[PDB]
Amino acid sequence: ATNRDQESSGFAWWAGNARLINLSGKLLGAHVAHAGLIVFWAGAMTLFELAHFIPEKPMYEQGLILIPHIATLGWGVGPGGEVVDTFPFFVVGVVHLISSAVLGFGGVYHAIRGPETLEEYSSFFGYDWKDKNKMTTILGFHLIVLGIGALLLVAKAMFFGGLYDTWAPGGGDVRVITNPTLDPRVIFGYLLKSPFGGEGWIVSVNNLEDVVGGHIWIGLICIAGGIWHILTTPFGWARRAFIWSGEAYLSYSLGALSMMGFIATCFVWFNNTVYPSEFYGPTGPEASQAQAMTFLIRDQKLGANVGSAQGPTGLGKYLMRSPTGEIIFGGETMRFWDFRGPWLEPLRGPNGLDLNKIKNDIQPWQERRAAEYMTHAPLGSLNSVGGVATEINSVNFVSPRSWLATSHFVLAFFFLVGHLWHAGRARAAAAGFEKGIDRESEPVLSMPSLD
Amino acid sequence: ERGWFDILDDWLKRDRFVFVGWSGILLFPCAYLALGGWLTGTTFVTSWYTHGLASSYLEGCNFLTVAVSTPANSMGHSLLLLWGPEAQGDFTRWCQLGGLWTFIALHGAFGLIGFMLRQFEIARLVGVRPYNAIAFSAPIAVFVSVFLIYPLGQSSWFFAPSFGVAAIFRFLLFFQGFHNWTLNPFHMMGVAGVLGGALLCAIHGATVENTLFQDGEGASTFRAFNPTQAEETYSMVTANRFWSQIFGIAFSNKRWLHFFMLFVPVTGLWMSAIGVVGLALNLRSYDFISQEIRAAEDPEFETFYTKNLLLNEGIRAWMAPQDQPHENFVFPEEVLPRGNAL
Amino acid sequence: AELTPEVLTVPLNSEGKTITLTEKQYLEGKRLFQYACASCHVGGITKTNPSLDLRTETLALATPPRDNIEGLVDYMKNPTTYDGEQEIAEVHPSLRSADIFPKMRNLTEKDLVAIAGHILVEPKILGDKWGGGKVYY
Amino acid sequence: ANLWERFCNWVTSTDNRLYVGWFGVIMIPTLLAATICFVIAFIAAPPVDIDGIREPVSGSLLYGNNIITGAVVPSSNAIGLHFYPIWEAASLDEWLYNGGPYQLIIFHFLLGASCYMGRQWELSYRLGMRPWICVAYSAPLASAFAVFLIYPIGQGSFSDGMPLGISGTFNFMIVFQAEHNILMHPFHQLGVAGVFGGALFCAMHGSLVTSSLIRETTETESANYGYKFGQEEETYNIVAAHGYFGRLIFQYASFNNSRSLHFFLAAWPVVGVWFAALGISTMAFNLNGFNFNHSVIDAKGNVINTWADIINRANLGMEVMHERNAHNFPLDLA
Amino acid sequence: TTGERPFSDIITSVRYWVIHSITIPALFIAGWLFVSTGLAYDVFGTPRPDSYYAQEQRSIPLVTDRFEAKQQVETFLEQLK
Amino acid sequence: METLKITVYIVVTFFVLLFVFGFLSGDPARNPKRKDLE
Ligand code: CLA
Ligand code: CLA
Ligand code: CLA
Ligand code: CLA
Ligand code: CLA
Ligand SMILES: CC1=C(/C=C/C(C)=C/C=C/C(C)=C/C=C/C=C(C)/C=C/C=C(C)/C=C/C2=C(C)CCCC2(C)C)C(C)(C)CCC1
Ligand SMILES: CC1=C(/C=C/C(C)=C/C=C/C(C)=C/C=C/C=C(C)/C=C/C=C(C)/C=C/C2=C(C)CCCC2(C)C)C(C)(C)CCC1
Ligand SMILES: CC1=C(/C=C/C(C)=C/C=C/C(C)=C/C=C/C=C(C)/C=C/C=C(C)/C=C/C2=C(C)CCCC2(C)C)C(C)(C)CCC1
Ligand SMILES: CCCCCCCCCCCCO[C@@H]1O[C@H](CO)[C@@H](O[C@H]2O[C@H](CO)[C@@H](O)[C@H](O)[C@H]2O)[C@H](O)[C@H]1O
Ligand SMILES: [Ca+2]
Ligand SMILES: [Cl-]
Ligand SMILES: [Cl-]
Ligand SMILES: [Fe+2]
């Protein structure tokens, strides 16, 4: 029992996985077994979703989060996002499920059967956390893998069927992307946009050409930096700025993952291009704008001049100006005038919403789409009663956007706490006082008093 | 003199797994019956005849919505004894009339007395100062002011809090709509005591845990402490320097620090109890007269104070008919206060 | 109180013929109403047009009358405006527009009767709560 | 000894009466800016059109407020989540009308308070302490982010951020109950257990240590003079405390290890407040409290009210009256 | 220690489980039957799903007198046909 | 307003650089125990 109790290792059972820090072979086992769990869930959850899936209901009425990811990639769907073939969903699930047994097998082997340390067995697979050269080489391999992964999305988009394009003329459809955006002023210009309203930083990406071209740049960048980090070793300025230890490296990744979880939270909440509303339901901004549109349409059909209807506050009942003058929907949805969506843009002119188009060009499919999104607003209770908090039981609904945004905010928050925990501890362990103050060497006793 | 009294004293004070004591003769039956009454009532007993509410697992409620509800308003402040003139010894009627509520409230009151006597009794036998009992006066002040004095000032027990999760939430919202209780400075002091006490709890625990002396070799620092050691397990000097330089001030007296941790939440609860005594009589902090005079005359004058009263007015009108069924409020749709559209 | 055959007896047509639903039909009507209709009609109101509700008194004064099984079954095939003047299949779910309202694709004639029966029975149970909105919650 | 190294040694010096440090270099100017603007605005700012409907709310003392009703009012609903620094306004008078000060205060405050958390880590490193006091501070810090930043983002407007005022706080809480039924959300319930339990264990630890102080003084003097700052020996008898409290409940319900006792004191309120912060942060995306409205139905199908339905009636009253001129359409979807 | 037998001793002893493999399910089944026989309703006076209202009434049988409260409830119970 | 904007941009940039170069300036070694961290 090497390092498998508190006396040998110094770590109690509730910190038991810290006993693995310098047992690369068992540590390898733990990581591979865990990746098997991830792949297992992806496969099993997909199959569960498929078994419970009725093609006639919108995905967002059915508690689906994985099939929408597959459908967005262009598998199983046709014009308007209608499901034409569930077999791709089946394949994706089965293959992930079968693969998890391979990963589970390797993980269990390395964890309990194989060599506990790898340094004696193989200098290629062995590593020391303090070997800055080996650590950047391992990092380099994984950057190359990630860069290949990004290029697979490009290959799917350009050569293997395309992607579902909510903006496609004629209602949304799978479309092959032939001219991805390669202009670095466009691609990197997303990175310097303000993150505030009307700008939205990278969350604002609104067309597939930019999405695909962004993954070309990211693929190349990851492969290049992966080669760079194989061939190089950290420079002097980098050496002096960081802590070089297993726990420190963990803490940096925890920081990175937390940041990504917060970005994913906003992506799914605001973006309706790579999270199409056909599959995920309308965004919150979208459903609120859809209500204004619904009642503009109803009232105009009854004979109202919606352009000149003065509401109780003096602002237009249906239409008003944004603070920079654009014609926008009135009422409380004035806050959401930055929303763009395929069902609304046909009414947009150079000055914002165009009164002539509103009076003459509103098509029945737009009225349908707005009434659907208004009645599937992302509001609902924890027990999945859809609607405002005061609504009665009847509708079993919580938007996928709410499920995905709340879960990933919670996970991102706790991963930020984990970064602080492990970065603070890595710093203290490196400097040598993570177990407490040495009584005979208490630093404050050697310092001058403050007053 | 070793009579029966002293022999009984001997037995009551034996060092056993559960200490009993003289106080235990009051504490154990009363605590057991109050808890047993709450479990019995939330599992099997209705509120249909007193409130018009289902309130038991038997009826389909869950852990959040079960309650032992207060008696009907027409019972007044009746003790509602099982053998009293209302139930007249009939256990089923007694349950239907709300007898379990006074049963829980009264055995609970005497159970609380017994727990505090237990704190005095054990403290006297072990030889410690009785500050734990003194601190426990604050939960007693809260219980007595909210569950006894408040309804005794009102029309009947019906307006006391009912013993359940969602029933207590309704009690919070009633106090906002009718009493404007958030505006009351005695509640504000209670909030300060409760949040400040939670703050002291977090900060003291974290400070000790992060100024520990390295008194062992393991990475788990819990093992490096012996209950009989004479040394402080953490550095008061290092802790004092940390907070002086982070916050400006710090504790330097460890006895003051732990008295203060007693003082802050105990005082807060006592202050909140006083304000609730005022609410027993509807002696509310409802309004600021100067604000009302200005706003009556100047229809452009708006503050967060006037915004909240409109919310209170909504709470009163929309919840009163269902929440006070004995009053028979019929409010036609046209009289209900509502903003535009909603 | 109990869900009796009296409660489950509703007008079949305008001429005064009644039909008595089974408890299974009523419960099936409730499930299908939730499936296909409650996103806009929960509680008997109409979220996208609150002027029109599903109260029987409102349905009686529609053109043609909708306060009976045949009128409601016809509405789900070929819905009209309240005065009968216009056909609104293009913006209201119906069998005629099952291509654009896919949830209507797997409704059968028997399902339409059950949904219709639910709409006619619920006010007999709920009184003002049905079609009354938040005032009666 | 060049000038940059001199500056770095002063910044990180453990001898300054107040530690500065690298986090402090950001902390000090941002907190000063937020404090100065807050004080000026609280006293003298003119009314603010919070809900974007040209209906200004008076928040400052000079415009008819006292300490309890005063507030710095959130920026206008017409601005939503747009960035509104002073230089985006045509004049100070426009900026004041539209609630500009709110944005300036909370952005500088959230930066400053995040750096306050880093500063707690930083000084613990310079003094050779363990590092996790700042992890306890993350619980109140996450809560401020929840009501000033996260909740505005999910709802699409800083006008639904918490006002910077006493009665403004109450308004925020009441409307929150109407729109999310937060009382019925288990994360708020865990938060209540966090702060109720925190206050209980605070009085508990205080009373037990005070109850077992070792006699070192006469009755005419404060028992606090029995402890001397820096002394080596503990000032109370934890064995007598454990002996009392173990008998109050039972022996195994009591702590005799001061280290795990104090860890428990840290963990309970910090974890509870984390859950409270996460409740606000996830109700920001409209995953609301449990809805049992009309959950209980009799044999005929009559609704049988529970206490949940009475709560609903109260919530409706708050819903229909809040922001009484701001809604033109029947659903308050944000 | 206070002299009683340690709990860990007791609950890993075969004799404990010989006794409690009977007494635990027996109590559970007694509680089940208290409900399934309908006895819980009659002990406590709790309405069954079909006894909250009469068939056509929608008013609560609310107690409105202090000293005739018992007779009021009995009268409400008669009116259930 | 433009002068205000340039001023704030310059002020913010100043303090951010101090922060970054500050932590780049051998910060792991600024502790009371082990300096040799690199
Ligand atoms: C993803 C979660 C995860 C993973 C992958 C690991 C992995 C590991 N843990 Mg950790 N641990 C975890 C969670 C995890 N742990 C949790 C939640 C706790 C708190 C309870 C701990 C507390 C803890 C302690 C205290 C210790 C470890 C140790 C270990 C290592 C050795 C385990 C061993 O020898 O058991 C031997 C156990 C068995 C032989 C029994 C069965 C084990 C197998 C793997 C069951 C697999 C079943 C599976 C269905 C079979 C699939 C086969 C199929 C694919 C063909 C191993 C790498 C030990 C260590 O560090 O050693 C140096 C150690 O002392 N862990
Ligand atoms: C990739 C992420 C990651 C990895 C690899 C590690 C790895 C480690 N952590 Mg870190 N940690 C992380 C993220 C991570 N952590 C996050 C996000 C947080 C914030 C919560 C922490 C907070 C943390 C603390 C406070 C501590 C560690 C510690 C450790 C070490 C011992 C871990 C152990 O044995 O736990 C054993 C696992 C358990 C005892 C089980 C935990 C059970 C959780 C709480 C249940 C959660 C509920 C679940 C999600 C849903 C309910 C399920 C239920 C219904 C069945 C190990 C090096 C310890 C350390 O410092 O060692 C150096 C330590 O004291 N971690
Ligand atoms: C990314 C995470 C994620 C998200 C966003 C979803 C979302 C969804 N799931 Mg999925 N699922 C997940 C992971 C996720 N799931 C995992 C890990 C499993 C395996 C357990 C499943 C297995 C699963 C099944 C079997 C089903 C779903 C269903 C659903 C839908 C309804 C959810 C519901 O009602 O929850 C109810 C809400 C809760 C249970 C609240 C959980 C509270 C947790 C315990 C708090 C944990 C906090 C934190 C992690 C711990 C911190 C501790 C601290 C000390 C550090 C919704 C679309 C349902 C569906 O509609 O399928 C189509 C369904 O039947 N899911
Ligand atoms: C990234 C995860 C990972 C890593 C770094 C290792 C590393 C190691 N393994 Mg382990 N192992 C793993 C996962 C991993 N394994 C998995 C998933 C399984 C189940 C299949 C195993 C089952 C296993 C056994 C039975 C043994 C090892 C052994 C070893 C050691 C020697 C291996 C060697 O020299 O192969 C040389 C390299 C090759 C043969 C090339 C293989 C190419 C693969 C099979 C094709 C796919 C490549 C492509 C990148 C895959 C993409 C997968 C992705 C989509 C998830 C080495 C330390 C040996 C050992 O421990 O000695 C004592 C040993 O006997 N492994
Ligand atoms: C997983 C990804 C990853 C990781 C962990 C690393 C890690 C490392 N890189 Mg490598 N690198 C990568 C990918 C990665 N790299 C890729 C894809 C490329 C190709 C572009 C490179 C090209 C590269 C070069 C040329 C160098 C490194 C170097 C290093 C080392 C120093 C890191 C550092 O100081 O950052 C700290 C970050 C900075 C100092 C940037 C400036 C600070 C700004 C102001 C922070 C801004 C933050 C702000 C919130 C940004 C938000 C988003 C923004 C874009 C708007 C470190 C070991 C250095 C090294 O030692 O090489 C041997 C080095 O010279 N990397
Ligand atoms: C190390 C360790 C651990 C961990 C472990 C793990 C984590 C493992 C993993 C594992 C895994 C991860 C496993 C997996 C497996 C899998 C499998 C075994 C699968 C199978 C499949 C199948 C058989 C399929 C089937 C089918 C088909 C084909 C079709 C459809 C239908 C169905 C589904 C039926 C613990 C913590 C315990 C502790 C101790 C140590
Ligand atoms: C894909 C895609 C795209 C693109 C993208 C990109 C291109 C990205 C990039 C990105 C990037 C490029 C990022 C970056 C990041 C960075 C970071 C995040 C950094 C950090 C840093 C740090 C953290 C540092 C720290 C420090 C200091 C400051 C001082 C000294 C010490 C230390 C080092 C600690 C787009 C949008 C078009 C569209 C969609 C898709
Ligand atoms: C009232 C009254 C009385 C009494 C009675 C009694 C005394 C009773 C008792 C009763 C009891 C004594 C009952 C109990 C019950 C219990 C239960 C019902 C429990 C349950 C539990 C559960 C359900 C759990 C859950 C959980 C938690 C809480 C956490 C952890 C985890 C778990 C999930 C496990 C007499 C005759 C004198 C007279 C008349 C009146
Ligand atoms: C917008 C952000 C831009 C970030 C740019 C990142 C580029 C990285 C290059 C950093 C430059 C290297 O230059 C860096 O600064 C100065 C050089 O005088 C040194 O500065 C410091 O040195 C040592 C560190 O041991 C300290 O004791 C000393 O107080 C200080 O002078 C750093 O040790 C060196 O690493
Ligand atoms: Ca390398
Ligand atoms: Cl309001
Ligand atoms: Cl509106
Ligand atoms: Fe203490």
Numbering used by the authors:
A (entry chain C): 23 to 473
B (entry chain D): 11 to 352
C (entry chain V): 1 to 137
D (entry chain A): 11 to 344
E (entry chain E): 4 to 84
F (entry chain I): 1 to 38
Can you quote the paper on this entry?
Photosystem II (PSII) produces dioxygen by extracting electrons and protons from water, which takes place at the oxygen-evolving complex (OEC), an oxo-bridged Mn4CaO5 cluster with a shape that resembles a distorted chair. In conjunction with the oxidation of the OEC, protons are released in a 1:0:1:2 stoichiometry for the S0–S1, S1–S2, S2–S3 and S3–(S4)–S0 transitions, and two water molecules are split to produce a dioxygen in the S3–(S4)–S0 transition, after which the OEC returns to its most reduced S0 state. Here we use pump-probe serial femtosecond crystallography to reveal the structural dynamics of PSII from nanoseconds to milliseconds after illumination with one flash (1F) or two flashes (2F). We identify structural changes associated with electron transfer, proton release and water delivery at various regions, including QA–QB, YZ, the OEC and the O1, O4 and Cl-1 channels.
Large difference densities appear on the QA side at Δt1 = 20 ns and Δt1 = 200 ns, become weak at Δt1 = 1 µs to Δt1 = 200 µs and vanish at Δt1 = 5 ms. These changes correspond to the formation of QA−, the oxidation of QA− to QA and the completion of QA− oxidation, respectively. The formation of QA− causes the counterclockwise rotation of its head group, concomitant with similar rotations or movements of D2-F261, D2-W253 and D2-H214, which surround QA. The formation of QA− also induces a shift of the non-haem iron by about 0.2 Å towards QA. At Δt1 = 20 ns, two negative difference densities first appear adjacent to D1-Q165 and YZ, and at Δt1 = 200 ns, pairs of positive and negative difference densities appear over D1-Q165, YZ and D1-F186, indicating their correlated movements towards P680. These movements might be in preparation for the subsequent electron transfer from YZ to P680. Notable positive difference densities first appear on Mn4 and subsequently cover all four Mn and one Ca ions at Δt1 = 20 ns–200 ns before OEC oxidation. Nevertheless, metal–metal distances remain largely unchanged, suggesting a possible charge rearrangement on the OEC triggered by the electrostatic effect of the oxidized YZ•+/YZ. Difference densities appear at Δt1 = 20 ns on W20, W22 and the nearby D1-D342 main chain; these are likely to be induced by correlated movements of the neighbouring YZ and D1-Q165. The difference densities near Cl-1 are observed when YZ is oxidized to YZ•+ at Δt1 = 20 ns.
